[PDB]
Amino acid sequence: LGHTFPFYAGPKPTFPMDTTLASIIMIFLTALATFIVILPGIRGKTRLFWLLRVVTSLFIGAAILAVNFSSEWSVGQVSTNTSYKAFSSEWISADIGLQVGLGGVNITLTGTPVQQLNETINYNEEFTWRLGENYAEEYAKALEKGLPDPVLYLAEKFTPRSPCGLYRQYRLAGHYTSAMLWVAFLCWLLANVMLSMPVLVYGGYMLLATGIFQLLALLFFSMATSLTSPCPLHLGASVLHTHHGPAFWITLTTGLLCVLLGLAMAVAHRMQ
Amino acid sequence: LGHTFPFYAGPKPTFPMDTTLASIIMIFLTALATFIVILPGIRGKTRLFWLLRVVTSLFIGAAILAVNFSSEWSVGQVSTNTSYKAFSSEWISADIGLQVGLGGVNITLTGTPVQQLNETINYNEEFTWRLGENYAEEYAKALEKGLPDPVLYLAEKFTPRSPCGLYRQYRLAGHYTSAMLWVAFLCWLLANVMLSMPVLVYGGYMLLATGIFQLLALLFFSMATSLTSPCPLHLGASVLHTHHGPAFWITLTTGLLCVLLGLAMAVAHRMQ
Amino acid sequence: VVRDYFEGSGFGFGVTIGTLCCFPLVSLLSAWIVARL
Amino acid sequence: REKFQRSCLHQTVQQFKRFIENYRRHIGCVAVFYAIAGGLFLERAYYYAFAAHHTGITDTTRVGIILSRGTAASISFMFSYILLTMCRNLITFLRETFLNRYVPFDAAVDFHRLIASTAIVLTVLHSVGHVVNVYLFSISPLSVLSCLFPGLFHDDGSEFPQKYYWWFFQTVPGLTGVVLLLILAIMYVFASHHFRRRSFRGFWLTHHLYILLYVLLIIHGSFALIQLPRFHIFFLVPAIIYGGDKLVSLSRKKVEISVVKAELLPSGVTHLRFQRPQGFEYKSGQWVRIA
Amino acid sequence: SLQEVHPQVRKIGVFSCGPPGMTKNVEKACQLINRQDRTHFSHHYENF
Amino acid sequence: QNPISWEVQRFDGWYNNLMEHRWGSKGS
Amino acid sequence: QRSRWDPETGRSPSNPRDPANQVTGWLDGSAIYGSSHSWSDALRSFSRGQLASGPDPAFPRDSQNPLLMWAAPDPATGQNGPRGLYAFGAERGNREP
Ligand SMILES: *[C@@H]1O[C@H](CO)[C@@H](O[C@@H]2O[C@H](CO)[C@@H](O[C@@H]3O[C@H](CO[C@H]4O[C@H](CO[C@H]5O[C@H](CO)[C@@H](O)[C@H](O)[C@@H]5O[C@H]5O[C@H](CO)[C@@H](O)[C@H](O)[C@@H]5O)[C@@H](O)[C@H](O[C@H]5O[C@H](CO)[C@@H](O)[C@H](O)[C@@H]5O)[C@@H]4O)[C@@H](O)[C@H](O[C@H]4O[C@H](CO)[C@@H](O)[C@H](O)[C@@H]4O[C@H]4O[C@H](CO)[C@@H](O)[C@H](O)[C@@H]4O[C@H]4O[C@H](CO)[C@@H](O)[C@H](O)[C@@H]4O)[C@@H]3O)[C@H](O)[C@H]2NC(C)=O)[C@H](O)[C@H]1NC(C)=O
Ligand SMILES: *[C@@H]1O[C@H](CO)[C@@H](O[C@@H]2O[C@H](CO)[C@@H](O[C@@H]3O[C@H](CO[C@H]4O[C@H](CO[C@H]5O[C@H](CO)[C@@H](O)[C@H](O)[C@@H]5O[C@H]5O[C@H](CO)[C@@H](O)[C@H](O)[C@@H]5O)[C@@H](O)[C@H](O[C@H]5O[C@H](CO)[C@@H](O)[C@H](O)[C@@H]5O)[C@@H]4O)[C@@H](O)[C@H](O[C@H]4O[C@H](CO)[C@@H](O)[C@H](O)[C@@H]4O[C@H]4O[C@H](CO)[C@@H](O)[C@H](O)[C@@H]4O[C@H]4O[C@H](CO)[C@@H](O)[C@H](O)[C@@H]4O)[C@@H]3O)[C@H](O)[C@H]2NC(C)=O)[C@H](O)[C@H]1NC(C)=O
Ligand code: HEM
Ligand code: HEM
Ligand SMILES: *[C@@H]1O[C@H](CO)[C@@H](O)[C@H](O)[C@H]1NC(C)=O
Ligand SMILES: *[C@@H]1O[C@H](CO)[C@@H](O)[C@H](O)[C@H]1NC(C)=O
Ligand SMILES: *[C@@H]1O[C@H](CO)[C@@H](O)[C@H](O)[C@H]1NC(C)=O
Ligand SMILES: *[C@@H]1O[C@H](CO)[C@@H](O)[C@H](O)[C@H]1NC(C)=O
Ligand code: NA
């Protein structure tokens, strides 16, 4: 239908989650669906065990990738009244949240209610300090864009020249944690490849190495983010306290699972 | 040595030519040197012919690549007196040259003499209209940088929104000429590969196809750059007229050489 | 006066769509003819 | 012995299990291939449904552009990688390796048809989508088209867009797509089972049009009307592998021999005894090719 | 019963060229026989 | 009521001018 | 040594090099509270709306992190370190008593 403009005047949809996590979930769910489809082709009573193995493997892989790309390592959230925009003395009541990941920081500003001052307050901004990316340039672009005051404040808190040294320590921690997680993912790939080979011992040792590298990434992130001097984040009349987020605990449980699986495989081989 | 700053206070050198052309020349000269070194290993009296073939092949390849990356397709040059910079009524005497290539235009402003108004006038600026590159953005960045008036004038002449449609036609011509030249380079690679194989006929036909694609690139560039309406380039008290540059004639001679070589190979095979 | 951009083009657009959809029919006719010969 | 089973329950599940146990490799390979195709389709669909608002393309065509772009990505991938099913030498080399326990190489030719049978379907959708787009582009104002295609249109106030035939025949993607549709119709009709039974020379005469098909696919997206051409990226490695396999096949010299005896054995079997080549040495279980 | 017919055999090769289910059954039988450590049955997937 | 009834001045000097946000700002 | 300059300038004659001001050009008490919000937070005690002070309430907290206060060594005695440098809005506030 024509004769009117625009042809599609409806609001343009927004993706309801992170695209990298969604893509990882979709790929691994497709693999799981294919394996479930071929499951009756797995002959004998082994299939159950097979199913478990397959699921475990996929989960591990997915977890690693998700944990490498999720900004859920250092999370914090407060409910505050704060100034919203320039040339306006009105304040907004909103939840302000910090989500520090390996490659950057996601600052969330969700209005309570979302519709305040005739504006939609559901900001989720990203500021990346990955190698080759200039954090100061991104903060300057955010300033020129005119982001709300809490977002600009939390972004300036992580600038390289800010008085509190969160930028350097967090960048180092995220970089080396991501490197260790990539090593763990490569070890997971090698373990999956070598478990099909007749030598199951090397596959078990590779799975144990995957768990070890996940735990090493955890330890490096903790040690590098703990050495920072206390940086007080004060918004409105409240203070934002950060803590290890869901990504940290997912990495912990996945690394422990891999370590235990490799140890059990080695012990079972030694005993049998 | 220390105790003074900077440690190396000498002027920083500038590369005396285009880097892509220099790299192509260096690579092909290295290949030629290796072949000359192994030349006595070529047994029998064939080596002379072999040498010729090798040289020809290398030259052809180099030419194609150079002709694909050189901005010597539409060249023009005038000597004029023109305004130099803003907030200054002084004029400079300089050679202003236009070098329109496949992927963009190089504007040269060489002072005569180079040292005029206590400034060094040897500008060679590039404005690219390649796919994925925004010519308007590059022109805006040049305006913000503060380039001299002739350079800005010649760059604005090629902007997409400029009254004379040089931008669209030149972009189309360069894009499809570059595509045809890449096809010719691939055909040259295939001809070199297949001339070692026992079937020399297919190698000769591939060389003929390389020549045909070079001639097709020439024809497309000519036809697409000739359809443009006359755009008068007036600087100072003179007018800049463009003509087919050295890249056009190099493409012509290389394509004719490839066509003649393939035709001669086919004729010799048919007669022998 | 309301300007209509597609006036005088519906019949030709339909004819173009019909030819695009008849490309397989033309190929099938040619295949049958060559199979007969 | 053979035990009794349910007339409508046990037989069905037993046949299902038999089919999966026999064709698990085929199911896995088809699932991976269609998963890659669907992933490319979904990537383009997501980009044009959630991450293309700054261009305003969906304000004029919301269903047509998504279908066209997703089908274009899947079509590029599948037409590029259909060549891997015809790498006779590579398939022969991989036939005896461990990969045969995961990939059924002997079904490659069948897989070939399958890929083609999918491609044309998506291709049709592709064309259909662009058809809708063209109609919308034929009823959108000049300002809208200038915003959508800055390098193609300029809003000078004339306010009248280009006609449908300008898109279909005066535009490089349009003409290339029309000729590609004609070539695909010819190839698919002549390569069908019916006309492959009817004739052999016509089958290959039409099937050799894949060279022109790939050339017109390279030309088709070259203009960069909507996005950068990605078909060459998909086509690069599979074309190189196919060309290398073709060169390897050409390297071998095919002997020419005569048949000593022909027997029409029952159940539609042909027993052919033919002259052994002078230097023909082979082991048990080996296979040859005949023409 | 091959172990009883041939008493002095220590390694027996079984080569399966057929549908995946049949070869799977053959290899499963070989593994079940190999679970007792009297004689070894080595199975091969052949694709002539 | 909110004791801060005015728009708090930024420490970095940004957004002081309505249309020239970088006027008087740090680094300008 | 030459001072900081605007990265968008200093490359072509029509746009010569222009220095960049490292503090806010406004007369907005930047020498008291700092030229950034993080600087202000570093200068604040977040208690009773007072600027942070050390053991003596009449003196601000000593600069501890190296990113806060300019630490030019003492020309007379060669003393270095922020052990005796007070934290102010201006980075060079401890140039002289
Ligand atoms: C960590 O953070 C990461 C970064 O956020 C995150 O990655 C991101 O994930 C999300 C999905 O999960 C994705 O990002 C989102 O993408 C949405 C869609 O993006 C397309 O559309 C936008 C919108 O463009 C329209 O509007 C602007 C003006 O706003 C116009 O200039 C445009 O021309 C266009 O206008 C047309 O369409 C309108 C639709 O109604 C019509 O009304 C209008 O008439 C026109 O027809 C485009 O801008 C996008 O293009 C940009 O990006 C691409 C690619 O980067 C560039 O190539 C291109 O040049 C552009 O730069 C794209 O086409 C976005 O809508 C969404 O943006 C919102 O969120 C971000 C982040 O918070 C804000 O910065 C942004 O301003 C938006 O917030 C406003 O709007 C939302 C509601 O949509 C409000 O809730 C919010 O509070 C805020 O409202 C305020 O402003 C409003 C006006 O803008 C105002 O109305 C309100 O009242 C209020 O004042 C978002 O960017 C994407 O996948 C990632 N993004 C990346 C990578 O950049 C990651 O997942 C996070 N990690 C984790 C673990 O969570
Ligand atoms: C088609 O055109 C293509 C584009 O030109 C071309 O590709 C290019 O090829 C050439 C080689 O053939 C290469 O480009 C050249 O590279 C040279 C070296 O580049 C490095 O150095 C420069 C200089 O930086 C110093 O100076 C600036 C200020 O000028 C400072 O800001 C810097 O901090 C630095 O200062 C230190 O060093 C000084 C040295 O004396 C000290 O004095 C000082 O105290 C400091 O210690 C850097 O800017 C470069 O970095 C930039 O680029 C990289 C990569 O792109 C970016 O990552 C980075 O962020 C920067 O953006 C790099 O590090 C350049 O010197 C040279 O530049 C001259 O030419 C261009 C083009 O004409 C002009 O735009 C530019 O302004 C320069 O022209 C001035 O200077 C020359 C003499 O050098 C004069 O002859 C000329 O008339 C003009 O003088 C005017 O300005 C002067 C001040 O600048 C003034 O003194 C005069 O009086 C007068 O007013 C050039 O860029 C490179 O390979 C390609 N470039 C690309 C791809 O961008 C292609 O080949 C062409 N095709 C064909 C077929 O020919
Ligand atoms: C655009 C669609 C298609 C393309 C690009 C394509 C491509 C190819 C190529 C490159 C070959 C190798 C030819 C050679 O090596 O000489 C081939 C062979 C073949 N194709 Fe297709 N094909 C397509 C569609 C089809 C369809 C629809 C069918 C059947 C319904 C089919 C059946 C065959 C057969 C039977 C062969 C012979 C293989 C052999 O003899 O080894 N193809 N195809
Ligand atoms: C009437 C018929 C068709 C029309 C109008 C049409 C139109 C288009 C257009 C406008 C594009 C965008 C290209 C660009 O932005 O420059 C495109 C891309 C594409 N189309 Fe078509 N098309 C048609 C038929 C076909 C056919 C028959 C095929 C395959 C056999 C096909 C496969 C593709 C592919 C692979 C691309 C992407 C090319 C690349 O990314 O390099 N289309 N089409
Ligand atoms: C924000 O303001 C509302 C309204 O005065 C108040 O009820 C709420 O407690 C305030 N939130 C905080 C964290 O002080
Ligand atoms: C703003 O919000 C109020 C209350 O939510 C509503 O009554 C009003 O219609 C909205 N719009 C304007 C322009 O005030
Ligand atoms: C430029 O000015 C000089 C000095 O007046 C003069 O000799 C020369 O002819 C002028 N060039 C042109 C092209 O008019
Ligand atoms: C400028 O050029 C003139 C003549 O070339 C020369 O005498 C002078 O020293 C140069 N420098 C200045 C600052 O005038
Ligand atoms: Na100030």
Residue numbers in the entry:
A (entry chain D), B (entry chain B): 4 to 275
C (entry chain A): 583 to 619
D (entry chain A): 1019 to 1309
E (entry chain A): 1504 to 1551
F (entry chain C): 22 to 49
G (entry chain C): 147 to 243
What's the paper's own text on this?
In addition to the shared TMD-DH catalytic core of NOX, the functional DUOX protein has an additional large N-terminal extracellular peroxidase homology domain (PHD) and a long intracellular loop 0 containing two EF-hand domains, and it requires an auxiliary DUOXA protein for proper function. The activity of DUOX is regulated by intracellular calcium concentration. hDUOX1 subunits and hDUOXA1 subunits co-assemble into a 2:2 heterotetrameric protein complex with molecular weight ~457 kDa. Here, we present the cryo-EM structures of human DUOX1–DUOXA1 (hDUOX1–hDUOXA1) complex in both high-calcium and low-calcium states, providing insights into the structure and mechanism of calcium activation for DUOX.
We prepared cryo-EM grids using the peptidisc sample, either in the presence of 2.5 mM ethylene glycol tetraacetic acid (EGTA; low calcium) or 0.5 mM free calcium (high calcium). The overall resolution of cryo-EM maps in the low-calcium and high-calcium states reached 2.7 and 2.6 Å, respectively. In the high-calcium state, individual domains of DUOX1 in the cytosolic layer are stabilized by multiple inter-domain interactions. The PHLD interacts with adjacent TMD and DH domains. The EF1–EF2 module in the high-calcium state shapes a crevice that embraces α4 and post α4 loop of the DH domain. The interactions between the EF module and DH are mainly hydrophobic and involve F768, F772, F807, F819, F840, and F847 of the EF module, L1463, M1467, I1470, F1475, V1478, and F1484 of the DH domain. DH docks onto the bottom of TMD via polar interaction between R1270 on M6 and D1367 on β7, and between R1113 on loop B of TMD and N1550 of DH. Moreover, both the FAD cofactor and NADPH substrate bind at the interface between DH and TMD. The measured edge-to-edge distances between NADPH and FAD, between FAD and inner heme, and between inner heme and outer heme are 8.2, 3.9, and 6.7 Å, respectively. The structure of hDUOX1 complex in the high-calcium state reveals multiple inter-domain interactions that orientate DH and TMD for electron transfer, and thus redox reaction.
